[PDB]
Amino acid sequence: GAMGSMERASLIQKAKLAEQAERYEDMAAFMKGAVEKGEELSCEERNLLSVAYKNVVGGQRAAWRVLSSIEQKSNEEGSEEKGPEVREYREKVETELQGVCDTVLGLLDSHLIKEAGDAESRVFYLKMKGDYYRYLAEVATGDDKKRIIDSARSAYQEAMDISKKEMPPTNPIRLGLALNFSVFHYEIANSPEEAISLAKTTFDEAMADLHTLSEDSYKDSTLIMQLLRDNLTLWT
Amino acid sequence: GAMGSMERASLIQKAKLAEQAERYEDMAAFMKGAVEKGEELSCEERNLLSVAYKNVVGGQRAAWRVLSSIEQKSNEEGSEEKGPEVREYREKVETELQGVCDTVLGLLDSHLIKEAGDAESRVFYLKMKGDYYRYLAEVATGDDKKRIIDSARSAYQEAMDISKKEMPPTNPIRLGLALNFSVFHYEIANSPEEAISLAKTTFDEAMADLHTLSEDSYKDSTLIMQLLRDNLTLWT
Amino acid sequence: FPATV
Amino acid sequence: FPATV
Ligand SMILES: *CC(=O)NCC1CCN(C(=O)C2(Nc3ccc(Cl)cc3)CC(C)(C)OC(C)(C)C2)CC1
Ligand SMILES: *CC(=O)NCC1CCN(C(=O)C2(Nc3ccc(Cl)cc3)CC(C)(C)OC(C)(C)C2)CC1
Ligand SMILES: [Mg+2]
Ligand SMILES: [Mg+2]
Ligand SMILES: [Mg+2]
Ligand SMILES: [Mg+2]
Ligand SMILES: [Mg+2]
Ligand SMILES: [Mg+2]
């Protein structure tokens, strides 16, 4: 680890600076270094980790989609053969994406998940595990595709089970998990009815619990609820 | 060169794909590989080179400015000491920026400039040389600062001399050079009157030559002229 | 694409 | 910042 010589606190400070500077690759490396110190992460620190890698892989996913579209077009009838370059470069970006996913999954497996005992931390990491297996599923075309999908599903399902037992229906992590698992159903598992059902039930149960919240918690919860509504609007 | 094994044409194809995918670091690496094949660059290829590195260094400059601002604030009276991390991370980004500038300058020196005989190519590369020494000047605080500034100035001045002799006042490269050299005067050389004079004279001489142009050339020229106007509005 | 967080 | 190209 290139970050092995840097203090945990300095890695966290620098991750924050990197976020301010919109340097998400640096942010992700700092946060990897912090995780590898071996201590559990606070809430703020888990958020830094997630934001960093979400931004890095988000950029790779967007790039992969642009390239995959160009590649598809090149493989339609009446398209002029332009050699292996589009496939090669889509593969390059794909491999880099896969590497990032593998890195995040490796952090989760060694050893964030196993040390996470509180519902809020355990659900957050299991949601991440689901997300990064979903990103691997997005680009999978091989022998392992079904197993990758199932890995995403299993991680999301464990998170869902804990969240429903341990968190209120308005809890932002419970909402965010549901939002993402619902997307997994729609986009990855070919289960749009499950996606819709989950988004709707999650929204409605949250609605009914808003009355219990402070103004600030209300703001947090309603923000993610609107994302559930946005997807339902997209899908219905 | 990691790109040594890839065909020139494939590097150019991939640079275009990288641009579409907004992967400017990859775009810059592909274009470096193309340059290092040792053949001169066409207009389109020079544009790819410039766009790639402009985007990479643009991002580094923005990040450097964010970090430099935070560092300045930390060095004001009544600011709480937060250790070496802000300086260290500004230095990290600075060193990476400098590396990119050095790489581009190295391409120009080995051997793009010396093989560029036509006004349009020679002026374009000399403008780049000015730009990348200007970016080095932006972060310079040392013994070499004056020499770095002078290197930018000299490159811009050689480009200016060729452009005024060889190109019409509406030529987009002549305009873009002037725009940038005018910025150099304002921001780097502490010569705002020179900056203003250059922007104004360049704009006015271009205005008077618009009548000679096709609709498409008119569009090209007026676009950059508006940038000259925008800066003059900023400065007056 | 749909929203995720 | 001023415009450059
Ligand atoms: C430690 C902890 O409890 N973290 C949960 C926070 C993360 C930030 N929150 C959000 O609402 C946003 N992100 C997010 C990320 C993961 C999950 Cl599971 C839920 C929510 C952050 C902001 C508000 C900036 O925007 C989005 C839309 C990304 C939601 C609050 C709970
Ligand atoms: C080979 C050659 O002649 N290149 C000059 C072109 C580059 C693209 N042009 C532009 O007007 C823009 N970029 C630019 C870059 C360098 C210089 Cl010296 C001048 C201009 C490209 C577009 C139109 C996309 O936007 C900006 C505003 C960046 C100008 C035309 C001349
Ligand atoms: Mg320590
Ligand atoms: Mg592959
Ligand atoms: Mg159910
Ligand atoms: Mg060859
Ligand atoms: Mg330095
Ligand atoms: Mg003059």
D5 close to B202: Cβ distance less than 8 angstroms: no
B155 close to B133: Cβ distance less than 8 angstroms: yes
Buried b (16+ CB within 10 A) or exposed e, A157-182: ebbbebbeeebebbbbbbbbbbbbbb
Which residue from A59, A48, D4, A17 is spatially nearest to B65, judged by alpha carbons? A17
**Structure token pair of residue B27:** 């775009």
Which residue from B156, A197, A24 is spatially nearest to D4, judged by alpha carbons? B156
As a whole number of angstroms, the distance between CA A212 and CA A204 comes to 15
Which residue from A151, A148, A149 is spatially nearest to A126, judged by alpha carbons? A151
Residues whose CB falls within 8 Å of the CB of residue B145, separated by 6 or more in sequence, listed in order: B137
- Closest Cα to atom 12 of ligand 2: D5
CA-derived radius of gyration, chain A: 19
**Structure token pair of residue A79:** 């398209």
Q: Which chains sit next to B, with 3 or more Cβ pairs under 8 A?
A: A, D
**Structure token pair of residue A193:** 């009815």
As a whole number of angstroms, the distance between CA B74 and CA B89 comes to 14
Question: Is A148 buried (19+), middle (13-18) or exposed (0-12) by CB count in 10 A?
Answer: buried
**Strands (DSSP E) found in chain A:** none
Which residue from A126, A150, A140 is spatially nearest to A98, judged by alpha carbons? A140
Judged by phi (left if over 0) then psi (alpha if -120 to 50, else beta), residue A23 lies in: beta
Which residue from A85, A82, A100 is spatially nearest to A138, judged by alpha carbons? A100
CA-derived radius of gyration, chain B: 19
Question: For tokens 């060193």, what's the residue?
Answer: B95
Helix, strand and coil in chain B, % to nearest 5:
80, 0, 20
As a whole number of angstroms, the distance between CA B2 and CA B111 comes to 19
User: Cα-Cα-Cα-Cα dihedral of B4, B5, B9, B12, to 10°?
Assistant: -50
As a whole number of angstroms, the distance between CA B176 and CA B50 comes to 12
As a whole number of angstroms, the distance between CA D3 and CA D5 comes to 7
As a whole number of angstroms, the distance between CA B113 and CA A72 comes to 40
DSSP designation for B148? H
Judged by phi (left if over 0) then psi (alpha if -120 to 50, else beta), residue A6 lies in: beta
Residue of A nearest to C4 (CA): A180
As a whole number of angstroms, the distance between CA A60 and CA B71 comes to 31
As a whole number of angstroms, the distance between CA B71 and CA B84 comes to 10
User: Cα-Cα-Cα-Cα dihedral of B215, B218, B219, B222, to 10°?
Assistant: -160
If one counts every other C-beta atom within 10 angstroms of the C-beta of residue B15, the result is 26
Write the DSSP assignment of A66-104 as a string of letters: HHHHHHHHHTSTTPPP--SHHHHHHHHHHHHHHHHHHHH
**Structure token pair of residue B44:** 């389109």
> Which CATH number is A8-235 given?
1.20.190.20
A147 close to A140: Cβ distance less than 8 angstroms: no
B192 close to B185: Cβ distance less than 8 angstroms: yes
A184 close to A152: Cβ distance less than 8 angstroms: yes
**Structure token pair of residue B209:** 């030559």
Q: Per-domain residue ranges for chain A? A: 8-235
As a whole number of angstroms, the distance between CA A129 and CA A106 comes to 10
- How remote is the C-alpha of A152 from its chain's centroid? 10
Contact criterion met (CB < 8 Å) for C2 and A234:
yes
**Structure token pair of residue B140:** 């310079």
As a whole number of angstroms, the distance between CA A34 and CA A16 comes to 12
As a whole number of angstroms, the distance between CA B191 and CA B185 comes to 5
Residues whose CB falls within 8 Å of the CB of residue A181, separated by 6 or more in sequence, listed in order: A130, A156, A159, A160, A198
- Closest Cα to atom 5 of ligand 2: B173
Peptide bond into B211 cis (omega under 30): no
As a whole number of angstroms, the distance between CA A3 and CA A36 comes to 9
What's the Cα-to-Cα distance from A178 to each of A77, A125, B148, rounded to whole Å?
41, 14, 55
Q: In B21-108, which residue ranges form alpha helices assigned H by DSSP? A: 24-36, 43-74, 85-107
Which residue from A87, A200, A60 is spatially nearest to B10, judged by alpha carbons? A87
Ligand 2 binding pocket (C-beta < 6 A) is B 43, 46-47, 120, 124, 127, 172-173, 176-177, 220, 223-224; D 5
As a whole number of angstroms, the distance between CA B129 and CA B126 comes to 5
What's the Cα-to-Cα distance from A214 to each of A205, A221, B101, rounded to whole Å?
17, 10, 52
Question: For tokens 């304002």, what's the residue?
Answer: B186
- D interface with B, Cβ–Cβ below 8 Å: 2-5
As a whole number of angstroms, the distance between CA A93 and CA A97 comes to 6
Name the amino acid, one letter, at A56. V
User: Cα-Cα-Cα-Cα dihedral of A61, A70, B1, B24, to 10°?
Assistant: -60
Which residue from A17, A96, A7, A8 is spatially nearest to B93, judged by alpha carbons? A17
**Structure token pair of residue A198:** 């989950």
Which residue from A30, A2, A23, A25 is spatially nearest to B85, judged by alpha carbons? A30
* Deposited resolution, Å: 1.5
Residue of D nearest to B225 (CA): D3
CB-CB neighbors (< 8 A) of A85 in chain B:
10, 13-14, 17
Method of structure determination: X-ray
CA angle in degrees (0–180, nearest 5) for A169-A117-A43:
65
SS3 A230: helix
As a whole number of angstroms, the distance between CA B227 and CA D2 comes to 9
What's the Cα-to-Cα distance from A20 to each of A13, B64, B82, B135, rounded to whole Å?
11, 11, 16, 21
As a whole number of angstroms, the distance between CA B220 and CA B212 comes to 13
Which residue from A96, A111, A97, A101 is spatially nearest to A40, judged by alpha carbons? A111
Which residue from B186, B164, B180 is spatially nearest to B224, judged by alpha carbons? B180
Task: Indicate the top mutation candidate among A47, A48, A127 to test ligand 1's pocket, ranked by most ligand atoms within 8 A of CB.
Answer: A47
As a whole number of angstroms, the distance between CA B22 and CA A189 comes to 29
